[PDB]
């Protein structure tokens, strides 16, 4: 048993809810929250900007030190950093950004990072401002992630559509 509440079960291991991932992280304090990161760990907008703002910019300070030491992530890659006040850990995962022209086939590689963690609170990768089709992102998630994932969908109207179209 875990502390996640009000989720619709989609599969054996994937759950979904209409929720603000920041508010959800603050309530649950999960072991792992996933960030919709870019390769520079520049947390400006979407889930990254919102998560970073909730940490009072401590996420960005830690991220800048990580990049200064290690250089940029790969598209499809990830790193584990602190969860600050939101979670034990933050898994920063880089899905492909369609609005920058990145290969959508890298979305499966991005979701494979989730399999290194038994339970995660996450957004849909490559969705929203990343420019990919969220229905596609949910399908790749269900077909790739084998660990237990609690998906927070921010947009109410998109959520109504993801549930009603899910196969
Ligand atoms: O809802 C999410 O969690 C996915 C990212 C996202 N997609 C949208 C699509 C259309 C309109 C608003 C949107 N807001 C969003 O946050």
C-alpha of residue 77 to centroid of ligand 1, in Å:
22
Discontinuities in the chain with C to N beyond 2.5 Å fall right after none
Q: How many separate domains does the chain show?
A: 1
Which is the closest atom of ligand 1 to the Cα of 155? Answer: 1
Residue 155, ligand 1, Cβ within 6 A: yes
CA–CA gap between residue 53 and residue 30 (Å, rounded): 18
Experimental method: X-ray
Query: How much is the CA Rg of the chain, to the nearest whole Å?
Result: 15
CA distance 84 to 19: 20
CB distance 16 to ligand 1 below 6 Å: no
Q: Is 53 helix (H, G, I), strand (E, B) or coil?
A: helix
- Domain containing 68 equals 1-167
């Amino acid at each position: 048993v875990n502390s996640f509440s009000g989720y619709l079960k989609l599969t054996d291991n994937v759950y979904i809810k209409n929720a603000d991932i920041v508010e959800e992280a603050k309530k649950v304090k999960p072991t792992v929250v996933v960030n919709a990161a870019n390769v520079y760990l520049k947390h400006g907008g979407g889930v990254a900007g919102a998560l970073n703002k909730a940490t009072n910019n401590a996420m960005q300070v830690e991220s800048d030190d990580y990049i200064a030491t290690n250089g940029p992530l790969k598209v499809g890659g990830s790193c584990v950093l602190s969860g600050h006040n939101l979670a034990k850990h933050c898994l920063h995962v880089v899905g492909p950004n369609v609005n920058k022209g990145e290969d959508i086939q890298l979305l499966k590689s991005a979701y494979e990072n989730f399999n290194q963690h038994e339970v995660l609170l996450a957004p849909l990768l490559s969705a929203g401002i990343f420019g990919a089709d969220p229905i596609h992102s949910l399908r790749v998630c269900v077909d790739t992630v084998r660990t237990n994932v609690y998906l927070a969908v921010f947009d109410k109207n998109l959520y109504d559509k993801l549930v009603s179209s899910f196969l």
